[PDB]
């Protein structure tokens, strides 16, 4: 059964949206003519243009298909009449009859803004016989919720040592997680959380590189992205080992030697280097060294 459907779109104020006008159940005899009027809310939408759809087969589509946009009347007039005079440019298949290209206005109210077939004349086939037709209204869902293409890769990271609430925000924050071979990255927040959005689909798998000054780089290979991907949870975080201070991807004596150069320094003193204060308690001492020792002799592969 012949049906004319105004489609749906979703946008934020300022977005350009495309609202398809579809025809279904087109008779075997084809459709040679049609006329109808759509009403819209010009508070929400500025119509930019109406593109003839794939169903419009006139090489000069404007000769068979035209619209008249009347913003003051809140109306778009659609007129179709196969221009060949012999049935050649009659609509013969179901599909997109036209595309309404509209800009959602800069300070437009939110909510669903209906686009409705407010007046309908007739669709008639090549023999001028009127075809009985169903009407379906549509519109644009205007919200302020952002939509990102591509996927979110997220997770939790935790340093492997003991610390309390006075320093948790300092030691949990600042891990860089990089998607290797891209410019995509995230930095952990005060809770050890990171998320990278807009990550392209890749079922072959990404490698993630987790890095931070004084930490042993961690590489997580084969991260498959076919959707939003969580690589770890706050209860079972990705652990990171501190002690790669002289950066050679190994925790060894040169790393400990660097802490010793600041041995017993306290926050505010000449020789205090905040990075060497492993546990950030305000003093550089054997307690910091013993944290380094937790993973002594370790290299990135040992994770």
């Amino acid at each position: 059964k012949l049906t004319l459907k105004i489609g749906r779109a979703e946008g934020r104020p300022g977005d350009t949206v495309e609202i398809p006008v579809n025809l279904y159940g087109v008779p075997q005899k084809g459709i040679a003519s049609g006329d109808f009027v759509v009403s819209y809310d010009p508070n929400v939408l500025e119509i930019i243009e109406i593109e003839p759809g794939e169903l419009i087969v006139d090489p000069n589509p404007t000769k068979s298909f035209d619209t008249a946009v009347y913003p003051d009347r809140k109306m778009i007039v659609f007129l179709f009449a196969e221009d060949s005079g012999t049935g050649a440019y009659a609509i013969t298949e179901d599909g997109v009859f036209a595309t309404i290209v509209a800009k959602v206005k800069e300070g437009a109210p939110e909510g669903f803004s209906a686009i409705e077939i407010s007046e309908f004349g007739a669709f008639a086939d090549n023999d001028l016989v009127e075809v009985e037709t169903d009407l379906i209204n549509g519109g644009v869902l205007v919200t302020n919720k952002p939509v990102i293409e591509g996927y979110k890769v997220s997770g939790y990271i935790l340093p492997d040592f003991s610390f309390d609430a006075t320093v948790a925000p300092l030691v949990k924050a600042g891990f860089k997680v990089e998607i290797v071979g891209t410019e995509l990255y995230a930095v952990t927040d005060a809770n050890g959380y990171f998320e990278i959005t807009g990550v392209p689909a890749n079922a072959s798998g990404y490698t993630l590189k987790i890095s931070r000054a004084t930490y042993l780089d961690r590489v997580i290979a084969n991260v498959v992205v076919t959707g939003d991907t969580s690589v770890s949870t706050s209860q079972a975080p990705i652990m990171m080992w501190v002690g790669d201070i002289v950066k050679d991807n190994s925790i060894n004596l040169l790393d400990v030697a660097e802490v010793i150069r600041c041995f017993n320094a306290t926050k505010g003193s000449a020789n205090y280097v905040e990075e060497l204060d492993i546990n950030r308690n305000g003093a550089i001492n054997m307690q910091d060294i013993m944290i380094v020792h937790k993973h002594f002799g370790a290299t990135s592969s040992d994770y």
């Binding site: 400990v256 010793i260 305000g282 001492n285 307690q287 060294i289 020792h293 002594f296």
Partner: protein, 163 residues
Amino acid sequence: SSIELKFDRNKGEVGDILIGTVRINNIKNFAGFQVNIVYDPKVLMAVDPETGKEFTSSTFPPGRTVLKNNAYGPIQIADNDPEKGILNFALAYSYIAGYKETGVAEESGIIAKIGFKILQKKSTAVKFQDTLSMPGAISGTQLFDWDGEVITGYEVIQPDVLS
């Protein structure tokens, strides 16, 4: 569970050397330590207990009977201020995960022997004392296990006054 400083002799003449022995007792899974020790440098001079050679800023006390297996990479650090009567030193195994795997913890032993040469026969005290660079220490002592964690819940046994 304790750490103690104790002297072999509590009396002496100018020029004698009193041997202060730092000892740990029943310290579970012990793998390292740091201590801060204060004395009055007008009365006592920190010296090697066997040679009488005077301590400098970098002198690490000899004589420990624990953490002596070079397989686990002991690292010793001294940061004394003899002019101000302060000894501060620390030693630990670096390969604690290897020491742990062996499964035999050295929980009692000597960690330092320190001579104090008598400069004056004046009543005087030597003691573990807290210091700014060791927050959370137990009277200027920090002991560490083979997991690299601070050990708590032990007594610090100070020596009696040296009269």
